Design a protein around this nucleic acid. Structure first.
Ligand SMILES: [Mg+2]
Ligand SMILES: [Zn+2]
Lengths: 147, 46, 245, 201, 98, 124
RNA sequence: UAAGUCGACAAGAAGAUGGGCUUGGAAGCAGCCAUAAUUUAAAGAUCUCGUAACAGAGCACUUGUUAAAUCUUAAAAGCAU
């Protein structure tokens, strides 16, 4: 079978490291080949930005990965001006039912949906329903919406 | 095998059967399970 | 208090349970055969979720490049490649053809107050409709002559139906070239302009789809016939040419 | 039964001969039920069986089919034998023409198997004896019943063949009874792709 | 149905022909990854005006090629023959494996 | 003037590209119309209710006829033919095609309660 | 329940999204908080396994094939084991 791995890495931080090394170094594929290859794919993103990746490993250890847009949760928190938690990363609400970390306007959501539509696999869905799916997550992270 | 008076199915693969019933005895109700052999049960003594 | 004889106004006596999705879904196709003049029949062969989204993605992208100069409503989203239930959908054609609401007689109906009110049961899920299709389907050779009999052999196995709100040949060319391209009549999109078409997932999904047939204004149409329809630029222009003569 | 209604497609070469009702006198019983002797001859051999009389066979020699039916579906005795008599005839037809086969896989270090002849224990002239070395201090040898052909393409692979499935699958069960598959190393005798879920350690 | 032993399938039938119903069902039984595994498949759709006899082509990994009529035998009968030859190959592999 | 962010509000942290600037809030009118409608899905003290709530509802209710207290069967259990008519026109086609999607959400909601209920009866 | 019940078999069982928190690690599946949406033939921020954590195999659920013309499922009661 052709296994698939999920890993979150920085923009230009591609090298043997917990997020990278043990994620695929144990399977057998060439790790360093992926690091020097990920830099070419990500050469216009701010240093340190999270970058989800879906690497596919075909039989005979021939790996190929398709870069994916940043996580929506990271965009909402980064767009809601939430307080940076431990480790230098913004955190959501521990109890979304009660706590509130930030408030994002509807216009801000419209821009968050366009950046996410750049993906081909997600470019077919209408933008009318795509803005409601991100508003559906704000309730799970403790972010209210103001018109 | 656990001999009980109230045999019950413990999963989806358990089956109720009446074996050892012949012209000389009435037999017992069994709970046979190919998945887990710990689900084997019987109802009655010899 | 509501009496026993009282029946809800929006729930007349049905031929079978209405809560189930069987009869609830039958009501959907019944109105689809009347609301959609142009309908294409396809056959999906174990298409995966990611493949389905990729197939419907090219449609939304392709159907968005069609012009609307005549000012008609924005018919660019109501076109969906919906998978139907072949079994229940087979009866849909029977009802629309072998049942006529005019052949029903009104009967007294008791409201919540108990007053007798005349009411007519014409819903497709009625016991009268169920009795009409059956007695009509009893004859075999006579049914083959109708439009339904001409489409019964196509409603075998999994079948997907494409619904177009109106008969717009312009939209057909954008859909017939993405689902069942047949060059040079309907060439597929180029690679330098629509790279999403030639993808790992999309390319593996289009090969599983096959245009088995199409239905237009309640008339059977063959595969080669759909090319003649889509081949026409627009319907209004076709009528103007006949006026020059 | 939904299996008894299914006609039995008689392939070319097979010949079914339905006898007539008979009763074998049994001094121990006061009334024996009539039966019908059904002979199923073909290329590989000939099998026989005696079915109850309440089962009726509509042997269609034209289209080469034979449908079974009972005299009363409300009786539990007739419903049961309706499907059972159908399953046996199916194995006979597809056994006298194509034949039944069984494969035994011997797992375990030191397990072997060879087909030889033991005239000192021959139950009939020319009986084959499957020699099995399954770790026992003594040699295990079993004679194939009259009508079965046993062979071993490999030391750890036996291949039984016969027209009677009940006789083939019953002999394979006698061989497997010497080493039943264990859940710790998979050692044993697996019949027709049998498998066992091993343990963790 | 066992499709692992099938190399390629070439079916030619007409949609509006009631005799081709069994051919359409056969195309659906194939798994999704049949194309990725390397199995080649070609489908030819005939016009509705003139209907030609439906043709069903099957080929196994051992060079065997099967051709059956879609009219006489129903879908339940075509699945039968494909399983018989595909089953002996499964047992043949075990005998010569290990 | 219905939005809280005026024209020019800088959207903080939405440009992950290095050679680019954060998005700028565009005019309110230029924004599409659906954004202003996608917010439709957002949903002793007890003694005060019985004294007021229990009395007011009974007044507006006017329990003298059986038409206000009717069952009001949900859409997911009705049998009346949807607004579908042959050769009705594009105006009727889209309208008929909108109810077929409306009943879709009705059945979709029924499965959540059932799927959530079956899971509850297995994890007691 | 021929609008194919029941059973079996074939495929599917998605996406926003590793929900947020916690944790060395928590990705449906240790635990806490939330669980209006979206798109679909259908798909619980998740019912049983599995992983150090991912992956993976099943279920709810969805389509198709086979196939019943007194033959589905459950309850209560009577007599038995
Ligand atoms: Mg979580
Ligand atoms: Zn069990």
């Amino acid at each position: 079978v052709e296994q698939v791995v999920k890993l979150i890495v920085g923009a230009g931080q591609a090298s043997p490291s917990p997020p990278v090394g043990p994620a695929l170094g144990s399977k057998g594929i060439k790790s360093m080949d992926f690091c020097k290859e990920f830099n070419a794919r990500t050469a216009h993103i701010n240093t340190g930005t999270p970058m989800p990746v879906r690497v596919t490993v075909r039989p005979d250890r021939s790996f190929h990965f398709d870069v994916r847009t940043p996580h929506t949760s990271w965009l909402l928190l980064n767009a809601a001006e939430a307080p940076i938690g431990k480790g230098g990363k913004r955190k959501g609400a521990s109890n979304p039912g009660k706590e509130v970390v930030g408030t994002v306007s509807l216009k801000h959501v419209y821009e968050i949906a366009k950046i996410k539509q750049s993906e081909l696999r997600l470019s077919g869905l209408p933008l009318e329903g795509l803005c409601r799916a991100v508003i559906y997550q704000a309730r799970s992270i403790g972010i209210n919406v103001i018109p | 095998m656990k001999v009980h008076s109230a045999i019950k199915k413990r999963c989806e693969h358990c089956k109720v059967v009446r074996r050892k019933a012949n012209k000389r005895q009435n037999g017992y109700l069994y709970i046979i399970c190919p998945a887990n052999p710990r689900h084997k049960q019987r109802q009655g003594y010899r | 208090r509501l009496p026993d004889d009282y029946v809800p106004p929006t729930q007349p006596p049905s031929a079978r349970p209405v809560d189930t999705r069987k009869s609830q879904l039958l009501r959907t196709y019944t109105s689809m055969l009347r609301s959609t003049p142009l309908m294409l029949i396809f056959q999906h062969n174990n298409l995966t979720a990611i493949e389905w989204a990729a197939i419907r993605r090219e449609l939304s992208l392709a159907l968005s490049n069609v012009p609307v100069p005549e000012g008609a409503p924005d018919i660019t989203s109501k076109i969906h490649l919906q998978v139907v239930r072949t079994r229940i959908f087979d009866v849909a054609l029977k009802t629309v053809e072998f049942f006529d609401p005019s052949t029903v007689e009104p009967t007294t109906a008791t409201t919540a107050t108990g007053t007798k009110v005349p009411a007519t049961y014409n819903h497709d899920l009625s016991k009268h409709a169920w009795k009409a299709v059956k007695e009509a389907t009893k004859n075999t050779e006579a049914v083959e002559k109708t439009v339904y009999g001409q489409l019964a052999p196509l409603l075998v196995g999994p079948v997907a139906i494409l619904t177009l709100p109106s008969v717009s040949p312009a939209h057909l060319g954008a859909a017939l070239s993405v689902l069942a391209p047949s060059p040079p009549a309907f060439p597929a999109p180029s690679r330098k302009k629509n790279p999403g078409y030639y993808d790992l997932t999309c390319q593996s999904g289009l090969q599983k789809l096959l245009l088995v047939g199409g239905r237009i204004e309640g008339k059977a149409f063959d595969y080669d016939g759909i090319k003649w329809v889509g081949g026409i630029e627009n319907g209004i222009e076709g009528l103007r040419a006949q006026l020059v003569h | 039964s939904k299996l008894g209604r299914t006609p039995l497609s008689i392939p070319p070469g097979v010949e079914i001969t339905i006898g007539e009702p008979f009763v074998k006198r049994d001094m121990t019983q006061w009334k024996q039920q009539p039966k019908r002797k059904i002979t199923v001859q073909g290329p590989l051999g000939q099998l026989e069986m005696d079915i109850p009389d309440f089962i009726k066979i509509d042997h269609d020699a034209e289209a080469r089919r034979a449908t079974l039916s009972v005299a009363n579906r409300d009786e539990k005795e007739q419903r049961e034998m309706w499907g059972t008599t159908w399953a046996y005839l199916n194995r006979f037809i597809m056994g006298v023409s194509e034949g039944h086969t069984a494969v035994l896989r011997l797992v375990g270090i030191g397990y072997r198997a060879t087909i030889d002849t033991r005239p000192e224990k021959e139950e009939y002239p020319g009986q084959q004896f499957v020699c099995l070395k399954l770790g026992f201090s003594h040699p295990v040898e079993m004679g194939v019943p009259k009508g079965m052909k046993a062979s071993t393409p490999q030391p750890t692979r036996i291949l039984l063949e016969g027209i009677n499935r009940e006789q083939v699958m019953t002999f394979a069960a006698d061989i497997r009874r010497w080493r039943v598959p264990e859940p710790y190393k998979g050692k044993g005798i697996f019949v027709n792709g049998e498998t066992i879920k091993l343990k963790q350690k | 149905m066992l499709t692992r032993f099938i190399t390629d399938v070439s079916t030619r039938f007409n949609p509006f022909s009631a005799k081709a119903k069994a051919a359409r069902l056969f195309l659906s039984f194939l798994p999704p990854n049949a194309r990725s595994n390397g199995m080649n498949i070609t489908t030819q759709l005939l016009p509705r005006n003139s209907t030609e006899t439906p043709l069903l082509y099957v080929k196994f990994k051992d060079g065997k090629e099967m051709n059956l009529d879609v009219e006489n035998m129903g879908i339940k009968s075509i699945v039968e023959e494909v399983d018989r030859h595909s089953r002996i190959l499964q047992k043949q592999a075990d005998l010569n494996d290990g | 003037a219905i939005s809280s962010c005026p024209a020019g509000t800088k959207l903080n942290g939405l440009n992950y590209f290095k050679n680019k600037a954060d998005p700028v809030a565009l005019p309110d009118e230029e924004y599409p119309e659906w954004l202003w409608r996608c917010l439709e899905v957002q949903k002793k003290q007890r003694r005060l209710a019985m004294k007021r709530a229990r009395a007011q509802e009974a007044k507006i209710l006017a329990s003298g006829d059986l038409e206000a207290l009717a069952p009001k069967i949900p859409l997911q259990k009705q049998s009346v033919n949807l607004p579908g008519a042959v050769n009705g026109g594009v105006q009727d086609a889209v309208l008929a095609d909108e109810k077929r999607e409306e009943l879709r959400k009705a059945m979709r909601k029924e499965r959540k309660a059932k799927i959530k209920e079956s899971n509850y009866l297995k994890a007691m």
